[PDB]
Amino acid sequence: IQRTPKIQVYSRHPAENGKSNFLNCYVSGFHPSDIEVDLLKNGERIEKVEHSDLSFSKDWSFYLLYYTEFTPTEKDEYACRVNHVTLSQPKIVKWDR
Amino acid sequence: FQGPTSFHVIQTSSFTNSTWAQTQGSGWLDDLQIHGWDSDSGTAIFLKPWSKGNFSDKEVAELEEIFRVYIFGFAREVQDFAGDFQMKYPFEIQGIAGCELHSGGAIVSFLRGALGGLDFLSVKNASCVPSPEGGSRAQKFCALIIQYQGIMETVRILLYETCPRYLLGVLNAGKADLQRQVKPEAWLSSGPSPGPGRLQLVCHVSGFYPKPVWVMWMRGEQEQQGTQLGDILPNANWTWYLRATLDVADGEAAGLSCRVKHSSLEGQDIILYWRGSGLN
Numbered sequence A: 001i002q003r004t005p006k007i008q009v010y011s012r013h014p015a016e017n018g019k020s021n022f023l024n025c026y027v028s029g030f031h032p033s034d035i036e037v038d039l040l041k042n043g044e045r046i047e048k049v050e051h052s053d054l055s056f057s058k059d060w061s062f063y064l065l066y067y068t069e070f071t072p073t074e075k076d077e078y079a080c081r082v083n084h085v086t087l088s089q090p091k092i093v094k095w096d097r
Numbered sequence B: 001f002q003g004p005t006s007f008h009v010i011q012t013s014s015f016t017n018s019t020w021a022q023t024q025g026s027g028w029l030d031d032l033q034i035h036g037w038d039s040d041s042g043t044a045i046f047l048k049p050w051s052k053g054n055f056s057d058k059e060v061a062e063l064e065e066i067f068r069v070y071i072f073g074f075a076r077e078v079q080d081f082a083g084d085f086q087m088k089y090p091f092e093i094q095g096i097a098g099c100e101l102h103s104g105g106a107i108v109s110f111l112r113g114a115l116g117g118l119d120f121l122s123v124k125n126a127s128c129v130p131s132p133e134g135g136s137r138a139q140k141f142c143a144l145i146i147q148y149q150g151i152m153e154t155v156r157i158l159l160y161e162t163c164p165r166y167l168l169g170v171l172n173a174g175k176a177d178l179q180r181q182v183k184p185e186a187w188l189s190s191g192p193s194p195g196p197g198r199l200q201l202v203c204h205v206s207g208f209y210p211k212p213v214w215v216m217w218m219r220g221e222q223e224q225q226g227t228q229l230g231d232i233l234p235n236a237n238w239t240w241y242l243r244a245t246l247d248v249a250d251g252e253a254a255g256l257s258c259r260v261k262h263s264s265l266e267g268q269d270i271i272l273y274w275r276g277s278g279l280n
């Protein structure tokens, strides 16, 4: 009856170390609507994160876009962390160029 | 014309228990949000300077009061009839209503409802149609909602008379954003191996607007039928992201290219060339 969120992490531009860019996290296919989404920089919550208002697709599953400006580096690690009623603990999906 | 052809309002009503329920809402031009809605104050948020279309402030304030009275009143009625409808808490109700401009110029209206993520009802010819997934509960809801000629009349006016004029006015008022052209950028990468002796080649296409785009893996002028399109994903600032992948045997990847056709390019297709032995 409940559907767990699908998480897709991608950059707006091709990743180039030291070049400014956008980090997107598309959270979709979930039900019910209540959800918690954070973007992480080396495991720590980014506070300057923008998001779309709740929407849903034709099967009535909900989706959201969360995004932030970032500059990818050799070592900095980025991720999207999601908590939903269907998950025991937050699910973390790492950014991979 | 290019860009969105439809306007729709959405509702997500969450009934946590017998004493608590909240409704989330917004207004959209296909996938582009133009209205926000504050859940507890019951007030609209205008996201673009042209979000009111050609409607006057008066008419917009009138519609806002209609949605506010509807939203608060909907939670009240659901809570009263919850018992009779054998509702177990928590439950979630969704709705979508709007209209669309077709080729030939006809505007078609729609209103759909869901319960628990499943289809519940739809509106056809100003009438409540119960959905099979809704069962006896949807049959009962439609029997009850027609008992109130007021709600019915209002839904009719909003769907078949307000929405078409609103849609034409807002597609005109917003045409500097809705019909702009933004060029994509494209790049190549190698994905995980799909199987023995195979590679996965990825063609990334991002930042384009409007949404229609053509991306194919090629061998010269020959389109590779193995090209798998991913889901068209959103970016910030009303643009899109797409991945077109191809499964190939190693040794057969040389000679491949990715070609992009988009309205904004004006016939000058983007062509990327896969090169061998890590020359990318």
Ligand SMILES: *[C@@H]1O[C@H](CO[C@@H]2O[C@@H](C)[C@@H](O)[C@@H](O)[C@@H]2O)[C@@H](O[C@@H]2O[C@H](CO)[C@@H](O[C@@H]3O[C@H](CO[C@H]4O[C@H](CO)[C@@H](O)[C@H](O)[C@@H]4O)[C@@H](O)[C@H](O[C@H]4O[C@H](CO)[C@@H](O)[C@H](O)[C@@H]4O)[C@@H]3O)[C@H](O)[C@H]2NC(C)=O)[C@H](O[C@@H]2O[C@@H](C)[C@@H](O)[C@@H](O)[C@@H]2O)[C@H]1NC(C)=O
Pocket: B054, B055, B056, B059, B164, B165, B166, B168, B169, B172
């Ligand atoms: C916001 O925009 C809407 C769309 O406006 C048009 O498109 C935009 C993008 C701009 O380019 C505008 O300059 C342009 O007007 C407005 O709605 C439209 O308004 C016009 C009136 O201005 C209206 O035209 C009338 O149509 C009736 C017949 O309509 C029936 O039949 C058609 C099919 O034929 C059907 O599609 C309809 O649904 C109806 O069933 C006709 O009798 C009228 O004729 C009379 O007036 C004309 C001069 O206007 C005169 O030459 C004739 O001799 C005769 O007296 C007239 O042509 C459109 O039908 C209507 N479009 C829609 C979808 O509704 C909208 O205007 C407001 O609402 C209208 C319904 C009307 O009450 C107006 O007076 C309102 O201002 C506008 N504003 C708002 C706030 O919505």
Ligand SMILES: CCCCCCCC/C=C\CCCCCCCC(=O)O[C@H](COC(=O)CCCCCCCCCCCCCCC)COP(=O)(O)O
Pocket: B009, B051, B052, B055, B060, B063, B065, B066, B067, B069, B070, B073, B074, B077, B097, B098, B123, B126, B127, B128, B145, B150, B151, B152, B154, B155, B156, B158, B159, B162, B163, B166
């Ligand atoms: C600037 C913005 C432009 C927007 C342009 C228009 C877009 C509109 C599209 C269609 C939207 C239709 C859905 C809204 C329905 C509102 C109904 C209604 O009467 O709500 C209000 C009052 O409602 C209540 O108090 C009753 C509570 C809700 C009862 C349950 C309703 C179930 C949902 C409708 C299902 C309809 C099925 C059959 C219809 C033919 C306000 O009315 P009024 O002002 O006359 O006092």
Ligand SMILES: *[C@@H]1O[C@H](CO)[C@@H](O)[C@H](O[C@@H]2O[C@@H](C)[C@@H](O)[C@@H](O)[C@@H]2O)[C@H]1NC(C)=O
Pocket: B125, B126
């Ligand atoms: C669409 O709605 C209107 C309500 O105003 C109905 O008149 C239509 O009903 C159909 O036509 C009438 C004249 C009568 O023959 C009736 O039996 C028909 O159902 C209605 N259309 C449909 C198909 O329901």
Ligand SMILES: *[C@@H]1O[C@H](CO)[C@@H](O)[C@H](O)[C@H]1NC(C)=O
Pocket: B016, B017, B019, B020
């Ligand atoms: C009803 O739901 C709210 C959360 O939505 C909760 O905090 C509250 O405790 C619940 N019931 C009571 C006893 O108020």
Ligand SMILES: [Cl-]
Pocket: A005, A006, A007, A008
């Ligand atoms: Cl996932």
Ligand SMILES: [Cl-]
Pocket: B001, B002
């Ligand atoms: Cl055109």
Ligand SMILES: [Cl-]
Pocket: B107, B108, B109, B110
């Ligand atoms: Cl229609």
Ligand SMILES: [Cl-]
Pocket: B190, B275, B276, B277, B278, B279, B280
């Ligand atoms: Cl390579």
Ligand code: NA
Pocket: A083, A084, A085, A086, A087, A088, A089, A090
């Ligand atoms: Na959880």
